[PDB]
Design an enzyme around this catalytic site. Sequence first.
Site, PDB file in Angstrom:
ATOM      1  CG  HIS A 190      38.065   7.488  17.268  1.00  0.00           C
ATOM      2  ND1 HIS A 190      38.141   7.623  15.716  1.00  0.00           N
ATOM      3  CD2 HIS A 190      36.896   7.964  17.506  1.00  0.00           C
ATOM      4  CE1 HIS A 190      36.843   8.005  15.425  1.00  0.00           C
ATOM      5  NE2 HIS A 190      36.085   8.046  16.749  1.00  0.00           N
TER       6      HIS A 190
ATOM      7  CG  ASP B 181      38.587   5.709   8.633  1.00  0.00           C
ATOM      8  OD1 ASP B 181      39.656   5.715   9.185  1.00  0.00           O
ATOM      9  OD2 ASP B 181      38.298   6.287   7.451  1.00  0.00           O
TER      10      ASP B 181
ATOM     11  CG  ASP C  96      43.342   5.470  26.793  1.00  0.00           C
ATOM     12  OD1 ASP C  96      43.664   4.710  27.634  1.00  0.00           O
ATOM     13  OD2 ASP C  96      42.931   5.408  25.696  1.00  0.00           O
TER      14      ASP C  96
ATOM     15  CD  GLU D 246      41.021   8.137  14.113  1.00  0.00           C
ATOM     16  OE1 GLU D 246      40.940   9.346  13.875  1.00  0.00           O
ATOM     17  OE2 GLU D 246      40.250   7.115  13.185  1.00  0.00           O
TER      18      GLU D 246
END
Length: 605
Positions: free
Chosen positions: A526, A179, A575, A584
Amino acid sequence: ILPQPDVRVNQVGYLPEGKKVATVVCNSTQPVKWQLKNAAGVVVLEGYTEPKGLDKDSQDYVHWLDFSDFATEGIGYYFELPTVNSPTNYSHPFDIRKDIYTQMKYDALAFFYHKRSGIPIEMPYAGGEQWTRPAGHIGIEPNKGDTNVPTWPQDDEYAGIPQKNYTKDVTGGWYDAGDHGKYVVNGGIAVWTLMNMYERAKIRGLDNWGPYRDGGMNIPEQNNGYPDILDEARWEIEFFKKMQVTEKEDPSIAGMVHHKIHDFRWTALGMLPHEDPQPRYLRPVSTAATLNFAATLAQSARLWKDYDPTFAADCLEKAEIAWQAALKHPDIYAEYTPGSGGPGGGPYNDDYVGDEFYWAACELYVTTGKDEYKNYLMNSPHYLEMPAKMGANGEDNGLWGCFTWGTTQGLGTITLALVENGLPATDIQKARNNIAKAADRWLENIEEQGYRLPIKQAEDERGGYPWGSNSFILNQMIVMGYAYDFTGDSKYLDGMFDGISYLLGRNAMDQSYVTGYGERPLQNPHDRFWTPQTSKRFPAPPPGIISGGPNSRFEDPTINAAVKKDTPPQKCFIDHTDSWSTNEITVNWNAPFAWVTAYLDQYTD
């Protein structure tokens, strides 16, 4: 879908000297013959396996294959089980060579360059034109930050404690994970870890080697007269100082540090930092963030003291201000907030800061030598403590390992055990003995595990493997490295060899958890940018980046739909780019990954 070989190995390979044990998935109750062949198919070694039984974490029936004594360098070795009746009676090819970790250590550290906010990612530093990108969050429309970031809207359901209304320039620092948030907690352990590997290297006369020297890393600051790894650390530290509240902003909490800064709400995958359209806001201060800040700026100050005295003096001055503010505001916690419909960044909540106080006191005492810090740390319940299994942040209770982003006492203890200081010689020896003691427990865990990893299932409610299980192993391996340093007993080095083997494919998934390495490399982390599964216009991630790994708490919809609820904990992984709870990537996972790979490569030499 690559087949899973019966003989599970480190999918990159092994240094010539050291413990080499493969895990063989095999139903036979009796030993079976094995052959090690070179790339030409010629048998160079043979033996029999060691039946172990049903392995609890994987529910695989396994044997061990010990070839530790084999040390002949070569490319493309592979095992075969000539008598075993299966379509997968072999291992993946692997190498025996001295440079297994030589490039990986640099790849690990390059993660932080890629994750930099406030600067364009360019060649040649990016390592590939496809990873190039515009600066993130320098106030250029799409972005609503980070040159003028207001404090959180006091209207918001999960706004947290009351804040005054003001704005801050908080540009720079690292993006934390997949993020676009930047967090002082979590950022703290990550930057502490980069500075610690540097400090250890300097103390062992290795600061002229690898990433520790000026020009040692492929970054913009590679010819500025400063150690490159400290240049990277400094990028986060400069951000940290911007997060500190000034007298002008709020006299009541001046010196306290904002917990984190990020989007008002969560964005979807498939976007670069410069595209993020969300309002950006400051979360309230936390005692934990303030102390993370005090600890790392104090460490920063002693390490920069000769390279950049001005910067170093400012680091120390701000650290001691943060310490005093924390003492007057010891109970301001970052509270839990929900991941859906809520604030658009991870909460990193923690309702206990006795460990951060101890950690900060340790760093400040080693840097300044002042009585106030000495007295604080010696009277702490964590004095000299090195957990083998944590009892700290609620979520860490009963988790195997030594420290995390929120259970930080072990960080202080490492500093006390490593860096010369004025504590009683016997106390320092105690800290070093506690480090060996913890490592010993983990060596036993390894012998109790089919796949020879140093954690075991959580001794809490839910049990199984926690979010980011791979990072617990990585942090354990740091402390094993320290145990090797202090005792010279190579069993501790072998413990690191076992741990890295697990991470590089000797596991129940036959998964290399590191991007760009192994026959089954980590491909789909991610991440908002490096996500081919969202759209093939986006690039595969750079190499040397480690996934959080198995998490059996079923904490995202993707893993929930991908595997049954009774899936063994070591197999609770996919995965897939949408599996944030299992796959992540973060600053606090890549930091100890860099620590450990540099350590192994140093051992190789």
